[PDB]
Design a protein around this ligand. Structure first.
Ligand SMILES: CC(=O)N[C@H]1[C@H]([C@H](O)[C@H](O)CO)O[C@@](O[C@@H]2[C@@H](O)[C@H](O)O[C@H](CO)[C@@H]2O)(C(=O)O)C[C@@H]1O
Length: 387
């Protein structure tokens, strides 16, 4: 789907996401490419006309020293040494402009791999790049302005007729990217236009996992509580006599001079089960939550007749749930309901004798709280090994 091109050439080694066919995976392989041939009107050739581009990208973590000092192109629109391109490097997204007089200007976005929880590593991020031929070129990340450089000294920019989506110059043989929702604009977008594009293309009716992919059923997720991200979920004991609690701190995954992050595959995984025709978790879906303890699934539930508004959650055997409250209404996070269809509360945590146990409390519904979760599945772009 491209309203900019008359011909779309797809190499034999382009992979498409089966759950979300909008997502395109381009490998560091020579047939892993998509060339689009712009319509004659969309082709850029001017000294004064402003233009802007936007796209979503998910960049896997850089794992080794073979990734340092290796700027490689991913989106190429340069012909006869003139035009624009998007390139990548170790912890960098790079925008480059070239005129017909060997003038070059680069605008760069930088993110670190030496952070506990990154917002960019192996996660979908919205990139917007805007260009005002009378002053500056700007790069936005998730709608926030990051950096800007002057381009007014650049003469005529005759871009290419084609746009080549392909990893070019990359020395990492395992390297790939995910890309979707490429767009071109014949104006300099302002912050509000970028803000609206970011929200419009977010698919707010579908829940997303930690990496930005669609939330799915029968997919094991490691849980992260956004109020205190240094904790992970554990199960004291299975049965109505045990509870779920948040214990910390998280571990570390390290590779010297490359990355130092918190480990994400920690704690008892959650598995979302269907209750009330695909494997996509949408807003207001009523689902079941299964929790694995020692490689065995059990049903998350509680006894809402317990004292206090904070209803401590237990992990019971599925055949032995009885009439205990278990239905969860997913929301884009988890609103546990009783069998009467009434809210018991958003799933969060509450301190009980120095133990931050997971509770379902309507105090959240009344009122970032302890009910803010992220679902972290195993992903090749992260690289960690599940313990
Ligand atoms: C005590 C503390 O430092 N933090 C609280 C936190 C804050 O009250 C608030 O979210 C700051 O923005 O809120 C959390 O705790 C809640 C309790 O304060 C409340 O009485 O009961 C809640 C459960 O029904 C919940 O435990 C939270 O938002 O989860 C965490 C912490 O206690």
């Amino acid at each position: 789907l491209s309203r900019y091109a008359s011909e779309i050439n797809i190499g034999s080694k382009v992979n498409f996401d089966p759950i979300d066919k909008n997502q395109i995976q381009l490998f560091n392989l020579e047939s892993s490419k998509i060339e689009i041939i712009l319509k004659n009107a969309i082709v850029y050739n001017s000294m004064y006309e402003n233009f802007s581009t936007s796209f979503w990208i998910k960049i896997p973590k850089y794992f080794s020293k073979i990734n340092l000092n290796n700027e490689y192109t991913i989106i190429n629109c340069i012909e006869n040494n003139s035009g624009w391109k998007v390139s990548l490097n170790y912890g960098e997204i790079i925008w480059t402009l070239q005129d017909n007089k060997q003038n070059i200007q680069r605008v760069v976005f930088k993110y670190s791999q030496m952070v506990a929880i990154s917002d960019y590593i192996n996660r979908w991020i919205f990139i917007t790049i805007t260009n005002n031929r009378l002053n500056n070129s700007k790069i936005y990340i998730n709608g926030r302005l990051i950096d800007q450089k002057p381009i007014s000294n650049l003469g005529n920019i005759h871009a290419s007729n084609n746009i080549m989506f392909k990893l070019d110059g990359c020395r990492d043989p395992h390297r790939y990217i995910w890309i979707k929702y490429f767009n071109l604009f014949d104006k300099e977008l302002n912050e509000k236009e970028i803000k609206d594009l970011y929200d419009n293309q977010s698919n707010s009716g579908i829940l997303k996992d930690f990496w930005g992919n669609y939330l799915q059923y029968d997919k094991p997720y490691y849980m992260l509580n956004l109020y205190d991200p240094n904790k992970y979920v554990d199960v004291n004991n299975v049965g109505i006599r045990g509870y779920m609690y948040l214990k910390g701190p998280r571990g570390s995954i390290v590779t010297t001079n490359i990355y130092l992050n918190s480990s994400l595959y920690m704690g008892t995984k959650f598995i979302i089960k269907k209750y009330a025709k695909d494997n996509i978790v949408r807003n207001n879906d009523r689902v079941y939550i299964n929790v694995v303890v020692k490689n065995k699934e059990y049903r998350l539930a509680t006894n809402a007749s317990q004292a206090g508004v904070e209803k401590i959650l237990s992990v019971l055997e599925i055949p032995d749930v009885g009439n205990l409250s278990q239905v969860v209404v997913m929301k884009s996070k988890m609103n546990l309901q009783d069998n009467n269809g009434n809210d018991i509360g958003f799933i969060g945590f509450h301190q009980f004798n120095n133990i931050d146990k997971l509770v379902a409390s309507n105090w959240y519904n009344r009122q970032t709280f302890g009910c803010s979760w992220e679902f972290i599945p195993v992903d090749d772009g992260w690289g960690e090994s599940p313990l």
